[PDB]
Design an enzyme around this catalytic site. Structure first.
Site, PDB file in Angstrom:
ATOM      1  N   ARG A  83       1.261  -0.969   0.019  1.00 29.42           N
ATOM      2  CA  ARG A  83       0.146  -0.316   0.114  1.00 29.42           C
ATOM      3  C   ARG A  83       1.499   1.080  -0.251  1.00 29.42           C
ATOM      4  NH1 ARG A  83      -1.884   0.912   4.449  1.00 29.42           N
ATOM      5  NH2 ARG A  83      -1.288  -0.584   5.811  1.00 29.42           N
ATOM      6  N   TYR A 222      -1.696  -4.295  -6.474  1.00 34.45           N
ATOM      7  CA  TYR A 222      -1.149  -4.486  -5.297  1.00 34.45           C
ATOM      8  C   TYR A 222      -2.161  -4.914  -3.625  1.00 34.45           C
ATOM      9  CZ  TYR A 222       2.309  -7.274  -1.851  1.00 34.45           C
ATOM     10  OH  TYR A 222       2.775  -7.746  -1.321  1.00 34.45           O
ATOM     11  N   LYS A 231      -9.303  -2.662   2.116  1.00 35.41           N
ATOM     12  CA  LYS A 231      -9.182  -1.145   2.814  1.00 35.41           C
ATOM     13  C   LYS A 231     -10.205  -0.603   2.467  1.00 35.41           C
ATOM     14  CE  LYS A 231      -6.179  -3.113   6.632  1.00 35.41           C
ATOM     15  NZ  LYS A 231      -6.101  -4.205   6.163  1.00 35.41           N
ATOM     16  N   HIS A 251     -10.625  -2.058  12.219  1.00 29.50           N
ATOM     17  CA  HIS A 251     -10.055  -2.266  12.199  1.00 29.50           C
ATOM     18  C   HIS A 251      -9.894  -3.446  12.968  1.00 29.50           C
ATOM     19  CE1 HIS A 251      -5.455  -2.720  10.612  1.00 29.50           C
ATOM     20  NE2 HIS A 251      -6.218  -3.648  10.044  1.00 29.50           N
ATOM     21  N   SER A 273      -0.058  -2.760  13.191  1.00 34.12           N
ATOM     22  CA  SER A 273       0.863  -3.823  12.418  1.00 34.12           C
ATOM     23  C   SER A 273       2.079  -4.269  13.543  1.00 34.12           C
ATOM     24  CB  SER A 273       1.249  -3.286  11.597  1.00 34.12           C
ATOM     25  OG  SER A 273       1.735  -2.130  12.084  1.00 34.12           O
ATOM     26  N   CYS A 275       2.017  -6.677  16.085  1.00 34.25           N
ATOM     27  CA  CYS A 275       1.588  -6.766  17.323  1.00 34.25           C
ATOM     28  C   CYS A 275       0.933  -8.274  17.878  1.00 34.25           C
ATOM     29  CB  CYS A 275       0.505  -5.624  18.018  1.00 34.25           C
ATOM     30  SG  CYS A 275       1.050  -4.060  18.134  1.00 34.25           S
ATOM     31  N   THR A 278      -2.530 -11.544  14.102  1.00 40.66           N
ATOM     32  CA  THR A 278      -3.030 -12.758  13.358  1.00 40.66           C
ATOM     33  C   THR A 278      -2.930 -14.267  14.997  1.00 40.66           C
ATOM     34  OG1 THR A 278      -2.597 -12.034  11.335  1.00 40.66           O
ATOM     35  CG2 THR A 278      -2.544 -13.944  12.004  1.00 40.66           C
ATOM     36  N   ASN A 279      -1.342 -13.865  15.608  1.00 40.21           N
ATOM     37  CA  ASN A 279      -0.995 -15.076  16.495  1.00 40.21           C
ATOM     38  C   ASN A 279      -2.440 -15.491  17.349  1.00 40.21           C
ATOM     39  OD1 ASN A 279       0.922 -15.381  15.427  1.00 40.21           O
ATOM     40  ND2 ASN A 279       2.044 -14.051  16.242  1.00 40.21           N
ATOM     41  N   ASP A 298      -9.368  -9.407  10.466  1.00 39.22           N
ATOM     42  CA  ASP A 298      -8.947  -7.884  10.018  1.00 39.22           C
ATOM     43  C   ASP A 298      -9.938  -6.887  10.271  1.00 39.22           C
ATOM     44  OD1 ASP A 298      -7.153  -6.180   8.498  1.00 39.22           O
ATOM     45  OD2 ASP A 298      -7.898  -6.448   6.938  1.00 39.22           O
ATOM     46  N   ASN A 389       6.682  -7.996   2.841  1.00 36.80           N
ATOM     47  CA  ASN A 389       5.401  -7.579   3.187  1.00 36.80           C
ATOM     48  C   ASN A 389       5.054  -8.711   2.040  1.00 36.80           C
ATOM     49  OD1 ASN A 389       3.158  -5.674   4.037  1.00 36.80           O
ATOM     50  ND2 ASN A 389       3.117  -5.284   1.763  1.00 36.80           N
ATOM     51  N   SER A 390       6.011 -10.131   1.838  1.00 37.38           N
ATOM     52  CA  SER A 390       4.842 -10.791   0.530  1.00 37.38           C
ATOM     53  C   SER A 390       3.690 -11.173   1.613  1.00 37.38           C
ATOM     54  CB  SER A 390       5.873 -11.659   0.175  1.00 37.38           C
ATOM     55  OG  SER A 390       6.367 -12.124   1.971  1.00 37.38           O
ATOM     56  N   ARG A 391       2.808 -11.945   1.173  1.00 34.96           N
ATOM     57  CA  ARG A 391       1.105 -12.151   1.056  1.00 34.96           C
ATOM     58  C   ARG A 391       0.825 -13.877   0.717  1.00 34.96           C
ATOM     59  NH1 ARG A 391      -1.623  -7.704   4.787  1.00 34.96           N
ATOM     60  NH2 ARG A 391      -0.018  -6.346   4.013  1.00 34.96           N
ATOM     61  N   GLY A 510      -0.045 -17.769  23.498  1.00 36.89           N
ATOM     62  CA  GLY A 510      -1.753 -18.705  23.694  1.00 36.89           C
ATOM     63  C   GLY A 510      -1.976 -18.627  25.122  1.00 36.89           C
ATOM     64  N   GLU A 511      -0.558 -17.975  25.901  1.00 36.08           N
ATOM     65  CA  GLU A 511      -0.724 -17.563  27.220  1.00 36.08           C
ATOM     66  C   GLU A 511      -1.566 -16.441  27.398  1.00 36.08           C
ATOM     67  OE1 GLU A 511       1.277 -20.975  27.968  1.00 36.08           O
ATOM     68  OE2 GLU A 511      -0.410 -19.717  29.165  1.00 36.08           O
ATOM     69  N   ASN A 512      -1.583 -15.836  26.445  1.00 38.17           N
ATOM     70  CA  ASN A 512      -2.488 -14.736  26.883  1.00 38.17           C
ATOM     71  C   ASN A 512      -3.760 -15.351  26.995  1.00 38.17           C
ATOM     72  OD1 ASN A 512      -0.382 -12.985  25.763  1.00 38.17           O
ATOM     73  ND2 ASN A 512      -1.147 -12.894  23.620  1.00 38.17           N
TER      74      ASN A 512
HETATM   75 MN   LIG Z   1      -4.874  -4.244   8.322  1.00 41.06          MN
END
Ligand SMILES: [Mn+2]
Length: 600
Positions: A83, A222, A231, A251, A273, A275, A278-279, A298, A389-391, A510-512
């Site tokens: 972006r 892209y 977005k 978001h 970003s 942080c 996704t985990n 997302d 930044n690959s996807r 995981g402990e989160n």
């Molecule tokens: Mn995003």
């Protein structure tokens, strides 16, 4: 050589049920002069046909189907890999309505520039007309769009990322409203000219017209520049709609957490970003009896239901995740989702057996082909094999922990809204807001480490479709007019606080789930905590640390609220509130004053 729309191939066979769409397509084709026009239906036969052409053009190579069925690798032009924020514009009638977090230009001036660029820009190319639906089709007011694009790559990824094609077109009926989204890679071709694998231009615009709900993109093929649902619609245009229509376009990941009671809780969580969101979206709890499922990682659209609660829906249909950093040890569920194939990878590395690789992934491959098509060697080559930044672009439906509610048009009732950032100091592992307005302030002042603290309000800093101050007022308005007992409780989490020696005070990952258990208990009124100047913060004894090999002193340190540190935080917040400008709501300034007063 210039052709009237009526004679452009594909327009004689165009769908006629919706006249507004047809007239618009004709206007655009008349301007851009494509070789032909194709209305996409989103079918499997269409998908394989476009992919065949993408392979023939060199845009795609087919990955080894024994490792990822129906999957492809694309390598982009090195100038077109992310972006481009500086080329992204909110073109409201007045600049103030774009506001200080946005790039503004007069809409008259922008249209003049871009219509000039669009003239003849699709010569030598097929122009696709791509109908799509943001959210489940069974929705009440489904948010429909049509993307016009000259990029086959775009079409195929839109098929994964949105509910694309026939169903969405029929939903539009004969005069239904839809977002007009226009896109060109800006690389016209002469008759017979050999194309490149990844056409693009040095000249780029990603422009939004909030009043008419339109998006004009030029020059990039892209990600969020070109997949206009991702977005542009989902956040920027949708936030403007949500502003006028009384709902929220945010978001946020959407997490479903299930307790040993077998009761489900739904959380919406906003992080910028870096942080590890996704985990968190695909959390595997480490305490017995707790389980977790995902509805998205997302975007979340939240709307009040009949019962006065906020319900969240994921407007997207696919995952478009950052590849590097994704691996089996930290995110086996993402790896499993990708393993099932149907995936387009962009700018990752190619293994000798036709598999894919990126930094962070297990395997220690000895040789790779990198994202620029060059040889790469283990412990030798000094450049990243995959672009940073690959996807991967992958269907949501093949995620093994996808919640069955994921495609329910009514969405899921939200018990908690979480805001998070990365902070070495000052901000506790978890804090609960005092009430909704305090929560808004907590979101509005979200801070995260930068190269020093960057403010990214509700993680929306580069994505708001209108004035950030008005956006805060909108949040304030929705809470004010709601049943307070029914609103989500607001929390701030910081997984990343550090000791003076640089240790991580909280093991995270995981402990989160142990922090989320506290959040669930608070929601059920089954947990206590300390009343601090910044909100309710648990003590070590409030958290379930059973089975966790951790120093309690570290956890206490992660939870500490030091008044001196927070007095130092104040002028940082104050500087940000000033930057918000004339539209800063009094309600947000009130919370600043109240925090300053509580700190003493
Ligand atoms: Mn995003």
């Amino acid at each position: 050589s210039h052709m009237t729309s009526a004679t452009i191939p594909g327009l004689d066979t165009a769908p006629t049920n919706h006249q507004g769409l047809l007239s618009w397509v004709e206007e655009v084709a008349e301007l851009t002069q494509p070789d032909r026009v194709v209305f996409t239906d989103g079918s499997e036969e269409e998908f394989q046909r476009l992919c065949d052409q993408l392979v023939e053009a060199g845009t795609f190579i087919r990955l080894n189907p024994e490792k990822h069925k129906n999957s492809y690798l694309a390598l982009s032009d090195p100038s077109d890999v992310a972006r481009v924020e500086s080329r992204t514009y909110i073109c409201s009638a007045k600049e103030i309505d774009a506001g200080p977090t946005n790039n503004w230009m007069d809409p008259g001036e922008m249209r003049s520039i871009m219509k000039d660029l669009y003239r003849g820009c699709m010569r030598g190319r097929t122009m696709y007309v791509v109908p799509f639906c943001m959210g489940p089709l069974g929705a009440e007011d489904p948010k429909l769009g049509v993307e016009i694009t000259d990029s086959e790559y775009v079409v195929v990824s839109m098929r994964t990322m949105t509910r694309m094609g026939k169903a969405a077109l029929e939903k539009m009926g004969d005069d239904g409203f839809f977002v007009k989204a226009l896109h060109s890679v800006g690389a016209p071709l002469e008759p017979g000219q050999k194309d490149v694998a990844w056409p693009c231009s040095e000249t780029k615009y990603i422009t939004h017209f909030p009043e008419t709900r339109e998006i004009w993109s030029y020059g990039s093929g892209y990600g969020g520049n070109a997949l206009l649902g991702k977005k542009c619609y989902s956040l920027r245009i949708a936030s403007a709609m949500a502003h006028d229509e009384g709902w929220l376009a945010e978001h946020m990941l959407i997490l479903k957490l299930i307790s040993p009671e077998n009761k489900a809780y739904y959380f919406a969580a906003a992080f910028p970003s870096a942080c590890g969101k996704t985990n968190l979206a695909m959390l595997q709890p480490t305490i017995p009896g707790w389980r977790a499922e995902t509805l998205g990682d997302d975007i979340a659209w939240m709307r009040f239901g009949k019962d006065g609660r906020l319900y969240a829906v994921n407007p997207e249909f696919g995952f478009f995740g950052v590849a590097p950093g994704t691996n089996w040890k930290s995110n086996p569920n993402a790896m499993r989702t990708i393993a099932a194939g149907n995936t387009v990878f962009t700018n990752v590395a190619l293994t000798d057996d036709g598999d894919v690789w990126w930094e962070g992934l297990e395997g220690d491959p000895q040789h790779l082909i990198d994202w620029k098509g060059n040889d790469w060697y283990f412990r030798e080559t000094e450049t990243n094999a995959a672009h940073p930044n690959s996807r991967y672009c992958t269907p949501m439906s093949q995620c093994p922990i996808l919640a069955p509610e994921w495609d329910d048009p009514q969405g899921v009732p939200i018990s908690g809204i979480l805001f998070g950032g990365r902070r070495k100091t000052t901000v506790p592992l978890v804090t609960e807001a005092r009430d909704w307005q305090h929560g808004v302030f907590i979101g509005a002042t979200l801070g995260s480490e930068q190269t020093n603290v960057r403010r990214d309000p509700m993680a929306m800093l580069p994505f708001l479709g209108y004035n950030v101050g008005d956006y805060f007022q909108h949040w304030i308005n929705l809470g004010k007019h709601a049943d307070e007992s029914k609103l989500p409780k607001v929390f701030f989490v910081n997984w990343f606080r550090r000791g003076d020696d640089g240790r991580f005070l909280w093991p995270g990952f995981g402990e989160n789930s142990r922090v989320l258990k506290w959040i669930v208990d608070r929601i059920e009124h089954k947990a206590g905590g300390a009343t601090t100047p910044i909100g309710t913060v648990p003590a070590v004894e409030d958290l379930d640390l059973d089975g966790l090999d951790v120093d309690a002193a570290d956890v206490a340190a992660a939870l500490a609220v030091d008044a001196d540190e927070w007095r130092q935080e104040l002028p940082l917040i104050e500087e940000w509130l000033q930057f918000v400008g004339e539209k800063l709501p009094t309600g947000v300034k009130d919370e600043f004053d109240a925090l300053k007063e509580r700190l003493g």
